[PDB]
Design a protein around this ligand. Structure first.
Ligand code: T3Q
Ligand code: T3Q
Ligand code: SAH
Ligand code: SAH
Lengths: 240, 240
């Protein structure tokens, strides 16, 4: 099964996350406000692992300039179509270099859990701090911690759009120091018939302290707020 | 994709048809009342293609002796477990010979559409007539008539039981004089993880006249009533 957010899996991403109730509007509003508490005059924002560019489309209404970075060509193409006047870069959060800084650097919906190892987590946070202005803010939404992840968790939901029915079912296990989440889809419509699709991801269960250490090593002060967009909390970092 | 009602598919059958809202309890009572209209003192009943024996389990409360016939060993295993004191035969509705006759011979939920052409349909009706008492009745629930079938129809539902979630989606097309219905499942539970299953059936769209021809050739009078347990109506046949 693919792990790379490509092809039909990428094409299905928006529909299934909206169908599950993800509200990128509220999240963007909440982000913009959190960003402004820490950095009252913030003007620009880079969203790293920006996926299909849903946060970016809403954040564009709150920030003068927004920009993205995304590893998967196929997610990125959706995001560019959604954000045709923003610059969105094809690149890797572990090692990119844009030559410019932003009032905010965000990395949402546990994209950071695609990293494996303290070294990768450290590298990425060093990048974020390399792209943040001196009076701005870095925001990283973590994955679950080892101690609060619920192994055996199943999600199942169905959404219909454009005449096509899409069912998504995930199962998640504790696979060592990461969550194995295996997701299957069935997609059906009168004219297209039925097709089955599948993806599978290891999403690293970093501990709180590992994130705190990566913020620290990057020069940032770090704070953690439990709950957050997805239940997993939110870490914010200020340069210093 | 299997076409033989076996393995996991046979194990998911009752749960999926329950989830879709099938009520074998009402259907058996309705069938018991139909049978006593045409044959007031009927006392025994053979359910042909009895599947998991859901009809028989309820028909046992209305008829003193029930018996089943079923082609899939795995469906039949479930039926026997459910109907421990009835005789349930492993065999083929086209060519079976039990050496006794019943007040009612029934064949429900369009199982008759698993037959390929007029010759098979005629042969199963003649076998039904061979197992019906002279003052008894044959009941056959047809598949859709060609004019009443909707190509492109999609069914999608998700049910959960025992912490296992089961999603079933089907899509149907016109294939020569039959419906091709392709059915996919996703089944996930905390311990067993997630799996995908699929089945596919060709169910013949016999016309009303083809059914009537088969009944009449078997020496049965024939009547069709629209509606019925599934929208497809019901044929009844009386010998003599
Ligand atoms: C409700 C809940 C879920 N979880 C875990 C179980 C599973 O690993 C995840 C929810 O899985 P989902 O709803 O199928 O996934 P979600 O929409 O959150 O997306 C997640 O996985 C997908 C594959 C990634 O692309 C995405 N970046 C992740 O947020 O969070 C918990 O640990 N505790 C919980 O209370
Ligand atoms: C309600 C309705 C159904 N149909 C046809 C379309 C499709 O082929 C079928 C319903 O699909 P389903 O609900 O997925 O199938 P159902 O539960 O009726 O079961 C049927 O297909 C399965 C595979 C057989 O084991 C079962 N013996 C059949 O009755 O019936 C129509 O053509 N028009 C309709 O309005
Ligand atoms: N090393 C890496 N650098 C950049 N993006 C990455 C990455 N590894 C995974 N990703 C991206 O991480 C995203 C995880 S899904 C989250 C997408 C988006 N942030 C949203 O909130 O909806 C995917 O788009 C995936 O391609
Ligand atoms: N030639 C044949 N003889 C007997 N059973 C058959 C058959 N072809 C298909 N079947 C059976 O037909 C059934 C269709 S599903 C309907 C099962 C059951 N009558 C119910 O109402 O739930 C399955 O059990 C299948 O194995």
């Amino acid at each position: 099964p693919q792990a790379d957010y490509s092809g039909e899996i990428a094409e299905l991403y928006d529909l299934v996350h909206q169908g599950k109730g993800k509200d990128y509007h509220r999240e963007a509003a909440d982000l913009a406000a959190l960003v402004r508490r820490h950095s009252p005059k913030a003007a620009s924002l880079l969203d790293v692992a920006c996926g299909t560019g849903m946060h970016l489309r809403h954040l564009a209404d709150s920030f003068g300039t927004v920009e993205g970075l995304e590893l998967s060509a196929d997610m990125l193409a959706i995001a560019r179509r959604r954000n045709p006047d923003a610059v969105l870069h094809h690149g890797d959060m572990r090692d990119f270099s844009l030559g410019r800084r932003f009032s905010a650097v965000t990395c949402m919906f546990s994209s950071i859990g695609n990293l494996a190892g303290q070294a990768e987590l450290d590298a990425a946070l060093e990048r974020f701090a390399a792209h943040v202005l001196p009076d701005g803010v870095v925001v990283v939404e973590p994955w679950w911690f080892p101690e609060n992840f619920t192994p055996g968790y199943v999600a199942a939901g169905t959404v219909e759009a454009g005449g096509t029915t899409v069912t998504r079912v995930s199962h998640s296990s504790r696979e060592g120091e990461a969550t194995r989440i295996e997701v299957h889809y069935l997609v059906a419509g009168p004219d297209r018939g039925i097709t089955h699709h599948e993806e599978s991801h290891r999403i690293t269960l970093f501990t709180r302290e590992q994130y705190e250490r990566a913020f620290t090593a990057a020069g940032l002060s770090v704070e953690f707020m439990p709950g957050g967009p997805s239940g997993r909390g939110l870490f914010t970092g200020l340069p210093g």
